[model samples]
Target: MAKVRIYQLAKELGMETQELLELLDQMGVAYKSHASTLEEKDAEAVRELVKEQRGLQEKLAEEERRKSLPRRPPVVVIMGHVDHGKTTLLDYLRKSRIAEKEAGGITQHVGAFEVKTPQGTVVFIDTPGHEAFTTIRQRGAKVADIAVIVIAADDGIMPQTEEAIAHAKAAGAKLIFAINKIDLPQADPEKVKRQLMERGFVPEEYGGDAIVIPISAKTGQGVQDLLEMILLLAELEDYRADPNAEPRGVILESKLDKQAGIIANMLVQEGTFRVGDYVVAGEAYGRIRAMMDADGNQRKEAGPGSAVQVLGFQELPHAGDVVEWVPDLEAAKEIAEERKEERKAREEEEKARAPATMAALLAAMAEEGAKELNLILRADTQGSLEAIQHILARATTEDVKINILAAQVGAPTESDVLLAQTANAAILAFGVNPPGSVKKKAEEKGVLLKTFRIIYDLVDEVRNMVKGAREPQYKEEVLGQAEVRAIFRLPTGKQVAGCMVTQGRIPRNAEVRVLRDGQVIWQGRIASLKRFKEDVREVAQGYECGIGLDGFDDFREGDVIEAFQMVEV
Candidate 1:
């Protein structure tokens, strides 16, 4: 029950490092290297796992078991550029469905909705671009199975389309291209298809497996074909779930209903969700008092691929929260309580840990001892960048070459690393260093970055392509806060709020945020901190002082003013 490195654990268990690593990966344990430390609990868990040896045959057996499970409808998320038919596509799918008549007033007004097709039902998530999609993934909620990328035929391709493609790839969703606005005079589906092919989406007609369906969401042209393609892909993908698996789903949206109290609209991912089942999502817990369909009609239960509104949450849960059914109400309460405490502790750890603080093409291109090195260069000034570029240019010889992807005069940023990742370039810093967060992001994405103080040192390092070095981090620390006791007018008719320091001290010229009703309404620097009739440098806790902030004269009683500044960590 003691902490140990992964290699030491492997040795203790009398197993090869490769074998232990495979098991850890299968169990969802993430380790950067064999030297990564394993906590006491995980070390013990690994020891227990080492007792059972599930060979390759065990995997094949599980494959058959997975295939035997019942098939579930595919959850599709439609993404596109702004004003490019994403909403129109969803609307068309909802209204033009065959079961619109029988479903009796299809009130699909939520994050997720259902479409009853002639082949089968398909679930659609009303995606709010990549931000919401990425946030849902952050919560460990894997809801969508396929992504339909809508691109306007006239526009060909755009940034948000590229963004959606990038996000969908990481989310592991199957991609389907929907070329919209085919009925327009300027529409060109073939041009869009060519652009898609350039980005690695070759159509099925070209002997590639990518499906590109042309549709006009306004006129409903080829929309049926898109649905058929989705069902066909669903059949091939064989999306399945065990009806009796642990009941779990994702909260698409939640709020306090006027009549029903706290109600959460959720999509049942797997298993049957029944009334009276105790559920826990985030820090909220309660029994499922009732389950309603999209029409707000009560139903006995729901199943995989079904969207339902459930009543009886103790508090309003957050959107994108993953809801899981616990065994009983007491167990649900305990789980929720434990999660609340963990969240509180985790927030503290993150505040302390948030110290602030991309691509494979170069390997294939850079041959013969890295003759070509791609780099994004940053310097303190324009002249420095120019000089750095000249030095890098001089570094280029008959057999060796240095490719400067970008040259800028500023501190390195995350976007710089992203560009470096895509271009398979390393980052070079001269006289300027990146913030801690950007450095960490570059490390995480496996992008090489080097900082140099001297010009010759930079030229020397540029000759060599790879080395990891971390710079120090600076983080914001809250200075203090004070409640606005009274509003005072100055001699010149300017206003200032007088108050006693609630805690710590508020110094002059410090960055501050003024909060009204616990909401930050203004943020600026403190213009003056006066102790009485005379100006003061700072006012400590329990001392009264008048504070005037720059350009923020709107002062209200019962408001709190907080002062903060960044300090090196």
Candidate 2:
């Protein structure tokens, strides 16, 4: 008998795979993900269920149409690398000192504000610049009508700048470039423009659709021009939403405020959001207790293109959730409870369907041409993790993709390794090591774990892996050079060289090349590095230290020791 996959059945039934998966769970069926196989009889039963649900939805969707409304301001998101003046640009537009209030001069959260330009009102969403906030930035892009990629003219394109571009592109928003810091002496707007062009952005001046404007966030030069360009794009898009219909918008951000309880920052996409309206977002539902605009002024109602903070959610709604006004509190509560049950079922199905090993994933991909390589990334810091993610995002092709299952700032833990084993993912740790026993556990579970200290090497390895290329060969990176000042033989017959680090830091366990007057003499590993008779991990440049080679100990006073490490290209 021919069997159909749950996802295929979902397609035939004109329902989402997740929706069908939830339905299967509700109907007491034992299945994994949407890709799980279904018997012919089971497929017919699912078809019936979908038909019933579709009829119910059709009836509910038969509401009267509202009158057409005027066009609204375009919701814009400013995204780029940290210290690239994303918040500074917004501050200059709003004439506020928000950047000054940020801790350590970094935007820590997503802030939505409305600013009035001479053209009209435009709601701007300022996302954090740090790579750790990738999810937040993506959510910001999702809720915005347009994305303005702010690149510092002096710095050009950075890792986070690529990340912002990826997010905006993924969200399918219109892209505009703002080359900021044009007032700097070394600022090169043309260089930034060329970089953008290389990344598939063609400026209107060059007969392309993308508008590239050079502005100084500090001095407010060309700020008006940027705003004008935004308005022009909005006009070309003809962005409009009916104001008389039920209110609908997306949650830009949400938090537990000290005084306002559960406050959610929202961008009203359509209709008027009035006080006391029952709103439902995902599994959270509530009647609006109060509404306030970006300026903290209480507003009776908000229309499309307005960014407002609403209070009264029973639970915190997630960022990027759609907020829709229900007819009444009962309707809102009922919908919330129904959606909550579906969400639980969906999660349970996902857990049940997760692959157990990389071999299994490979088998499935070969059989189905899914072509997804999942990864669990562990990094020493937020910056490196972000950089890895940014590069990996761009490296994806039509045939294959790198999917990051989880990324965080920490060493690889047993749990991370275990999750990779379950999800059929590889563990990519950057500038971080596994916790104690994790390596043993990974080995026992047959999990592939790769570690790297350099960023580009990590990206290159993964990119090649995704492309199904041969394993990357290793290359050397020279760390530092030191001149042997004196040779000493220890009591244990181990020869240690007294050296001065002349160029870079000589780290313990690094490979060393003995050079005598620019000629290579011996190549070996550094057994020990010490300073002042005390064992040390590294010796910096312009400092005197002691070095011990693993196999070769013949050290001449005038010999130079070149320290290096092997990295995969």
Candidate 3:
């Protein structure tokens, strides 16, 4: 191997000479000085260690130098069960600027509106339910800073309330409970507090950290206190933004109005965006013609925390599409075009790679001409299975086509796993666990087998599938691919296969799948990896190793061993 100086290799790895020397000390690699010579193999091992951590969010977060403003208003979302006074509470507080009143339910379509109070301004995002928020989160957009769970004191906590908590938890947002219907005789704040504890919301008055405020949307009791509490929480959170940087935001809602060609309601999350600027959202791109606040007053510019309705979009952008401002009009168009192509390729990517998770399967099924999601369902009770089918049917959209290939009353069977493979479907087991052997068989067959306890969870996932927003449990990454060159018996009386790594590198902890004729037939763990007669932690590309699979001794010379790492998405 070629000899390399310590500083020379340090420069290649983008590490300081001192940092590299210290790392070498910790790694048990002796080095005399920065100019000390190192074998190429030793340098390679150091490179491997440095390559372990590749950051995404933190890197981009730091890519742009943040200039924090003194104060930026918090964006909040109000959620609860359908009849739990969410709209009433929002309407009562929204009295500050109710704006339009064409009919009774004028503000339902507002999607997002601002509430300016004596304490401080807080922007409220209005939605049908958790669907829109979930979709936005799946796109990796920064969403609400707080989630206000509006619970009716008379009704206490409901099913949808639990779902709202789940959505808020998923967003990692601060939660506040607004107990409505305090005017009614049946309304019991203490009972609501007891129910709240069931969902992990222990009130502060009861020596717990939860924040619960009781109010009546009709009588409006404790309404001002809620605003005060919001500002208090906002102060503690210390969310900051930059007003002097490039415009960046997220779309709240979009529509093609008869008056305006295409109107999009969006919130400016960072920097100041002005009229006539070239903006791109998803595949929609155009120069801003006009911008108006929630009250329909025209504005020239919108800064961080400002909610505005913008006009002059080439096409309707979907809710949650991140809006980015570009310097040139053509640049905006090109960026949008690239994103359009990228979204289309997302479908192609799943087609090229067989999906192992339910989310990926939904994505693959969302491809053009394949808008159908095939599933084999198994439940403990026959009545529940029928109810599930009916519930899942309600999730059918113009784009989503669900086909239950098979439905049975029991845990998943080996036949169901085989049926899923033959029919290109997933198996959903509810209320029962499958046999361990069957689960193993499903894994070997590369079929997605998901278990759900609650019917609500299944319905929520079906809704997610319809919106193309299903979150994957695991993101598959292929670590390496190796071709079997020779098979032999080891002196230790164990069968070993000599393989040449053709692509990437294999780590000892990788889970492997054997591919014969470019098709996966067996899945197992890496029993051991050896370089020559010595065990190595990893084998890089172009290197040879004696590989042994955990459960298999049979090795074919032409077969390929593929190593993979499953990371949580």
Candidate 4:
């Protein structure tokens, strides 16, 4: 009855000693054989050792399993401009010839599926790959382990293809070129390879190691090879994870469900996850209410290298946030609170620096009143984009011309941001998403993003905004007048100037210009415009005032201080 020889005792209580010994080692307890026919003392000791080892082994093995399992699947997010066949390529790889059974016969939602091949099981996440997913990719949500950039064999590498290539590289993943639709009449494999070469990805056919798989995901050709290539690469990378450790991973996608509260698609990088375990993901924490694989079947537990949708969270976690498991519910709550505070601070900072809205854009446009309205357009595809562009062009008024600063088919790439910043233009995306990180960067830089799905609605809304923006009038009033007669350096390391007001009242917001020998040297806004102890709106011709300009320290004795007003203009 003693715990020490409980294994032998239990086996005696149930079965024989020899059977019990084998079970002891299998349960991770080291056992030694008896010299001859088993003595009662030896059997008793074995039983105790077996009991002790079982409990110890179970705990250790659980931890080990959690550390060793591949809890997170490598999320492969496919993205590009529209009609570059991103969805088509995904369909080809995922559906093969079996797609006809689906209700719509098309992949609609963001799909997370496991691909089993001789190499290994790989979880492939199929996003819209348009502007939306581009933003997702930009945000780092689409943290693909490897990007299979699908370029049309006939079209070579289009702008979106280039953008996808750049995005994949930036996401810090290996690239596999999926040259799809090879059976088309105008398919050009060599041309596509050359284009890839230009982009620094020399194909394997061209004596390079880059895997440029010629696939017709539509025709079911090359699909097997593509799966094999994914496995081969995974093997080459030796993708091993510790399933015995606490689970660590990213939220592939998340949404709110009426019954579930919040559900998240988790790609476990390592470890085991089970119901009743508490999870801390971004600003949200919850006890696992339910677990389901990609197919939505209920599961009691999930291991590494699995992409499964989890339910029972209190709130939605972001698409790309790293997920972690805490030992207790209290710890999970604490982590959630800390993350929430951090996110709030970040959001407050962003709000303080929000850039030009539609009102500001229209006001600026009307003030400029130029013949051409310049813009930078980043989108998902050429066809829908062409329609959008054409509609926008027709929507322009006589007072404002429309000029595209730059237009390309792709995600809102870093290049798009740079171009938009340089051109001082707003970026419009149709069905394209910026990566999460890129979106954060763009937001920080005050880059405006307008995304839309339907063509006419986008065009109509833009037209109305542009039209409504036109009539906002700007009145230029000269509020301050000053002529610099004398300038002197004071003992307080400051410059003082004696000025005579020549015209209208001088206000605090007056633009200032310093002239020397009839030439303007400095031009800036007035930091402070005051008359003695009082701040006056205007100084008459006989009135004198001390004025300071923002960031200007130089004031020559003979330099004339000229003040002008700045209104909307």
Best by TM-score: 4
Cα lDDT tens digits for candidate 4, 67-160: 5545335656565555556677767667762445663433333336666555356666665554333242434544457777777765566665
Estimate, for each residue in 273-342, the C-alpha lDDT of model 3 and write its tens digit: 7888778888788878988776567888787777778887788776566888887877877888787798
Tens digits of per-residue lDDT, candidate 1, 1-569, equal 35567787777768899998888888898789998877677766766664555555687888787777775756766653234445676776666654336756757665677767675577777634323123323523557777778786665566656866776677666688888787789888888878888888889899987888887777767878888888888767665566667776787766555777777788888888888877888888878898877776788978787787888778877656688877788887888878879988997886642333112223224545334456677654443455565556555653445656646444667778768878887777764678879888888888777877555677777655522112122234465667777766667434667776764566664678776775677787877655446666666557677777777646557577776765321
494: Cα error in model 2, Å: 24
List clashing residue pairs in candidate 2.
none
Model 1, C-alpha of 218: deviation from truth (Å): 2.2
Residue pairs whose backbone atoms clash in candidate 3: none
Over the full model, what C-alpha lDDT does candidate 2 score relative to the true structure?
A: 0.67
Q: What lDDT does each candidate get?
A: 0.68, 0.67, 0.67, 0.64
lDDT of 2 by residue, 1-569 (tens): 36566666667668887787777778888886766777777767866776878887876665323223366646666654344455676666555424244334332233566656665677677533333343544344356667777777656676766876777777666787878787878888888878878877888888977788887777767877877888887778655445666566777666555777778787787777789777888788877898876555788988777777888788877655688878777888788878878988997886644764433442344444344566777765555666676677676663565656656555557678667867788888764678668878887888777877466777777765664422223323465667778765555435667777765466665677777765687887877665547666666557666777877745547566776664320
Our model 2 lands, by Cα RMSD against the true structure, at 20.9
Off by over 4 Å in 4: 1-72, 97-110, 131-142, 256-261, 346-461, 468-569
TM-score of each: 0.51, 0.50, 0.50, 0.52
Error of 4 at 119 (Å): 3.4
Candidate 4 TM-score, true structure as reference: 0.52
Model 4 lDDT at residue 439: 86
